[PDB]
Amino acid sequence: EIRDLISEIDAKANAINHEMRSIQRQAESKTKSLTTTDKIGILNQDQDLKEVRDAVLMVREHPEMKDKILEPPIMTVSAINAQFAAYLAQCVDYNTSKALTVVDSDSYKLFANPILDKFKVNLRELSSADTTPPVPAETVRDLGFEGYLSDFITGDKRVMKMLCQTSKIHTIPVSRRELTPAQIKKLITPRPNGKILFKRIIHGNRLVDIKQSAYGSKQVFPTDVSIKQTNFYQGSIMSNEQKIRIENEIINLKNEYNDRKSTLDALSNQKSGYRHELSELASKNDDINREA
Amino acid sequence: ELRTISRSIQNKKVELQNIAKGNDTFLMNFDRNMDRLLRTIEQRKNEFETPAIGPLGSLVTIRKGFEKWTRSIQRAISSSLNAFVVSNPKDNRLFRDIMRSCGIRSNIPIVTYCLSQFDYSKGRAHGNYPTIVDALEFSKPEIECLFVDLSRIERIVLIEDKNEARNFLQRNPVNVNMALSLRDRRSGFQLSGGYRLDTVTYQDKIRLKVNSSSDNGTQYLKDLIEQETKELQNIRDRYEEKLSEVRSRLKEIDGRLKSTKNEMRKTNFRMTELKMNVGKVVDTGILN
């Protein structure tokens, strides 16, 4: 019975070891409601991002590259909410989102070749280009926008400056509300100087690219694109209700499984106690036999 | 993943059969309900001041000799290929209501533009390299002018070698905004300003007409589904060879577990021998 109990409690403790493993996982999941603790895991989602992960690991391994080559915007930049994350992912091209940022031209000459020879990754050099917004943020609020896309994102200032130069996020006004057709018509109409105020605007779930023809009568034409939801650039992972709709539902089914497992192993603990009681009663009977 | 791959290959094969007509619909490259949307536009054409024109990729064909550039060109003009053109804001509202009634799920850009022919000769790239304009054939001259305005196709050059393309752009060639370079069948290079090099993955679905017979691509892709079954097997068994290595590690530790079980059973036999020895008859009474 003792060796059977040894196997029973070893199996109970093995089930408890699996149960404790599940506890670690669910505890990590609940505390992972906020931005991912490590972003090296975001690069494990796609085969194209594994080479970017290996290049980031090489940059982390070489101390000389740490301040000269910066990690990609998908890891270093986070939007204040999930909706601004969708706006950022629609405005920044995927290759720029996964590109390493080189701080200066000398760093490009010294460290671009060793990375490009080993990994097929995109590099973006920081330029001296001015990143001033086309109008003050008060005038943007008067036009019905909450602010520029640059105002609703946080991250390394150098990587944000690179995104401002390549994707012009500091020039894109953003409103979570849809603008009225009269407001949109005022924004598309060129000013008396012939220039449109904003080339790209975001309102509600739509990104409007206002293009003025470089040729002919300089006709202005808008192009409207529905904004897709994204799990990348997401400082707020799947918003809050949406995160609960997926994560909470699935993780809590797994958590009820975990509770069942723990209670089954606690019942195995009760059975060990019953085997212990029976073993203690048998030991008492053995003591009575020894007295006899 | 590999199931999806072979299946998409086969559906593309049957879609080029639908270039003329058939079961799996060819326009499916833009949206599953695209055939329904176009029929509803034609049925309600009298309600439009100018009927909505699109999807633009259906009005553009790759010229013979530029077939190798199809995926690279499509990646460069991918925003424009899915677009529809409407002459005025009223037709734009009517078109959005028809899109809602037809159940379109794809994000379709709507361009409000008055189609006009204009001279863009001054804007053409100057060089020995062909542009996207030279690689394409347009159903109407106004559609060619629209791609010049929307995507500056007259300023995008096609250069096979990446270093040659970088060297050409570094010289600041007149009227060149970007160079497209080839890398492999799944990806290419987009170069702007001679310093920016972007590695771009090609989209699986083709949204440009190719003057090659559907059988060329589909049946060359029939031998290429032979090669894609090669892809499935390779990926699956490299992961399974990985699985085999790790499960051989598992069997090694199981034999170590079996060896520990044998040691434990021997210890159990030895403790059983000990308790057998404890309970043995004592022959010391005559000795005492």
Write out the DSSP string of B119-174. Answer: --GGGS--SSS-BHHHHEEESSHHHHHHHHHHH-GGGEEE-SSHHHHHHHHHT--T
- The answer to whether the CB atoms of A122 and B199 lie below 8 A apart is yes
Please tell me the distance from the alpha carbon of residue A42 to that of residue A27, in angstroms, as a whole number. Answer: 19
Strand partners, A153: A79
Are residues B22 and B13 in contact, defined by beta-carbon separation less than 8 angstroms? Answer: no
Are residues B15 and B28 in contact, defined by beta-carbon separation less than 8 angstroms? Answer: yes
Nearest CA in chain B to A290: B279
Please tell me the distance from the alpha carbon of residue A224 to that of residue A210, in angstroms, as a whole number. Answer: 9
CB contact set of A86 (below 8 Å; sequence gap of 6+): A227, A228, A229, A230
Q: What token pair was written down for B16?
A: 């080029």
Please tell me the distance from the alpha carbon of residue B198 to that of residue B192, in angstroms, as a whole number. Answer: 9
Please tell me the distance from the alpha carbon of residue B21 to that of residue A102, in angstroms, as a whole number. Answer: 51
- The answer to whether the CB atoms of A211 and B150 lie below 8 A apart is yes
* B156 residue type, one letter: I
Could you give the strand order of the β-sheet that contains B196-201, starting from the edge strand earlier in sequence? Answer: B156-158, B178-182, B187-192, B196-201
Q: Which of A182, A209, A210 is nearest to A195 (CA)?
A: A210
- The answer to whether the CB atoms of B149 and A123 lie below 8 A apart is no
Q: Which of A200, A217, A224, A208 is nearest to B149 (CA)?
A: A217
- Pairing status of strand B196-201 against strand B187-192: antiparallel
Please tell me the distance from the alpha carbon of residue A169 to that of residue A161, in angstroms, as a whole number. Answer: 9
Please tell me the distance from the alpha carbon of residue B191 to that of residue B197, in angstroms, as a whole number. Answer: 5
Which of A48, A95, A163 is best to mutate for the B interface (most B CBs within 10 A)? Answer: A95
H or E element at residue B180: strand B178-182
CB contact set of A147 (below 8 Å; sequence gap of 6+): A137, A140, A141, A173, A174
Please tell me the distance from the alpha carbon of residue A221 to that of residue A198, in angstroms, as a whole number. Answer: 13
Are residues B45 and B91 in contact, defined by beta-carbon separation less than 8 angstroms? Answer: no
Nearest CA in chain A to B122: A215
- Pairing status of strand A173-175 against strand A147-148: antiparallel
Interior angle at CA B78, CA B172 and CA B151, nearest 5? 40
- The answer to whether the CB atoms of B112 and A123 lie below 8 A apart is no
CB contact set of B50 (below 8 Å; sequence gap of 6+): B86, B87, B88, B91
DSSP single-letter state for residue B47: G
* A11 residue type, one letter: A
Q: What token pair was written down for B132?
A: 């996207």
A214 touches chain B (CB under 8 A): yes
Nearest CA in chain A to B269: A3
DSSP single-letter state for residue B112: E
Q: What region does B65 belong to: left with phi over 0, alpha with psi -120 to 50, or beta?
A: left
Nearest CA in chain A to B121: A215
* A73 residue type, one letter: P
Q: What token pair was written down for A188?
A: 């598309």
Query: Prior bond to B55 cis, omega within 30?
Result: yes
Q: Which of B30, B29, B50, B51 is nearest to B39 (CA)?
A: B51
Set of chain A residues whose Cβ sits within 8 Å of the Cβ of B104: none
Which of B5, B75, B113 is best to mutate for the A interface (most A CBs within 10 A)? Answer: B113
CB contact set of A126 (below 8 Å; sequence gap of 6+): A101, A102, A103, A104, A158, A161, A162, A165
- The answer to whether the CB atoms of A216 and B116 lie below 8 A apart is yes
Please tell me the distance from the alpha carbon of residue A229 to that of residue A205, in angstroms, as a whole number. Answer: 10
Nearest CB to A3: which of B79, B112, B268?
Answer: B268
Q: Which of A233, A248, A245 is nearest to A33 (CA)?
A: A248
**SS3 call for B3:** helix
Nearest CA in chain A to B198: A122
Min Cα distance B85 → chain A (Å) is 9
Please tell me the distance from the alpha carbon of residue B161 to that of residue B197, in angstroms, as a whole number. Answer: 13
Set of chain A residues whose Cβ sits within 8 Å of the Cβ of B181: none
Please tell me the distance from the alpha carbon of residue A216 to that of residue A272, in angstroms, as a whole number. Answer: 89
Helices (runs of H) and strands (runs of E) counted in chain B: 9, 9
Q: Which of B163, B162, B144, B164 is nearest to B154 (CA)?
A: B144
Please tell me the distance from the alpha carbon of residue A20 to that of residue B172, in angstroms, as a whole number. Answer: 63
Please tell me the distance from the alpha carbon of residue B75 to that of residue A243, in angstroms, as a whole number. Answer: 32
- Residue A231, number of CB atoms within 10 A of its CB: 14
H or E element at residue B110: strand B110-112
A151 class by beta-carbon count within 10 Å (0-12 exposed, 13-18 middle, 19+ buried): middle
For residue B208, how many C-alpha atoms fall within 13 Å in the half-sphere facing its CB?
Answer: 29
Could you give the strand order of the β-sheet that contains A173-175, starting from the edge strand earlier in sequence? Answer: A147-148, A173-175, A200-203, A206-212, A220-226, B110-112, B84-86
A51 touches chain B (CB under 8 A): no
B83-93 per-residue burial string, b: 16 or more CB within 10 A, e: under 16: bbbbbeeebbe
A228 touches chain B (CB under 8 A): yes
